[PDB]
Amino acid sequence: EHDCIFEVKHEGKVTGYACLVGDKVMKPAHVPGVIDNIDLARLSYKKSSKYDLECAQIPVAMKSDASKYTHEKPEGHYNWHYGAVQYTGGRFTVPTGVGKPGDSGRPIFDNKGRVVAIVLGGANEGARTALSVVTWNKDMVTKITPEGTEEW
Amino acid sequence: EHDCIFEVKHEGKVTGYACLVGDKVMKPAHVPGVIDNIDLARLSYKKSSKYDLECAQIPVAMKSDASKYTHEKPEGHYNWHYGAVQYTGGRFTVPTGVGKPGDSGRPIFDNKGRVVAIVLGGANEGARTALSVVTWNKDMVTKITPEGTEEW
């Protein structure tokens, strides 16, 4: 279902997205640019290149309109802004030809309607493709990045 | 009816408006930040802190798209961007509520469309509040702030 998620643009084009996950505001750091909204970008965030997350806290009304997350992921079927995604064996996976370079940051929802993780693109096959994600393992962050692919 | 011309933006956000009268461009002086319309911001603004006005004179380019003004005023009731306004004893008691900070520079329009005054703030001992006004009468620019003026 449709909601509000801000987006970073660069010089008359688009380069990806940046989300408002509940308690903080955050974005990937592998794509350059500044958020469109001036009161969500002019502040000073904190950056870590080893996990590629740029994060800080939210203003007050932008806190009043937020999202809601979860700290686990069970095996089953999910949906995202392009379609459906199967998660099993530690693998979110989608068909081929369902994205373009520059969609890194669209959130992924569970069945109940809460955000489970974020996306970093990056997987290929001559059939249904995999994902590369950054997720929350019981109040602490971890990464998932299958080999063979670059930062799509 | 109404006009919607020549606002001001600063630091991504806005800081109100500024209106042009038959020959010159006025702006309330106490607010920071400069105008966005690059054809106007090329000028040199006369800054009188004692009367709180910014007083550049316009070039002849958009001088054909100017406004209409006057300096004669009977008692009665006028209209502006946030509703109606009443003129008694000089002071402008508005049907109220819609005022805010930040949006000083809203000019005051009469029934016959001619510009009669601009605004500089509010002051409110209950309903139908009496705002502050920059105005003029027969070559004399006056600043009329009634009492305890909320500095917009």
Q: Return the ∠ at Cα B121 (arms to B115 and B133), rounded to 5°.
A: 35
Q: Is A39 in contact with A45 (CB distance < 8 Å)?
A: no
Report the alpha-carbon distance of residue A80 to residue A99 in Å, rounded.
Answer: 12
**Å from B28 to nearest chain A CA?**
24
Report the alpha-carbon distance of residue B45 to residue A10 in Å, rounded.
Answer: 34
CB atoms within 10 A of CB B77: 13
Neighboring chain B residues of A39 at a CB cutoff of 8 Å: 12-13
Instruction: Report which of B40, B50, B29 is spatially closest to residue B6, judged by C-alpha positions.
Output: B40
Task: Indicate which of A38, A40, A43, A62 best probes the interface with B, i.e. most B CBs within 10 Å of its own CB.
Answer: A38
How many A×B Cβ pairs under 8 Å? 7
Q: Is A29 in contact with A51 (CB distance < 8 Å)?
A: no
DSSP for A110-132? -SSS-EEEEE------SSSB---
Neighboring chain A residues of B12 at a CB cutoff of 8 Å: 38-39, 42
Resolution value, angstrom units: 4.4
Q: Is B92 in contact with B130 (CB distance < 8 Å)?
A: yes
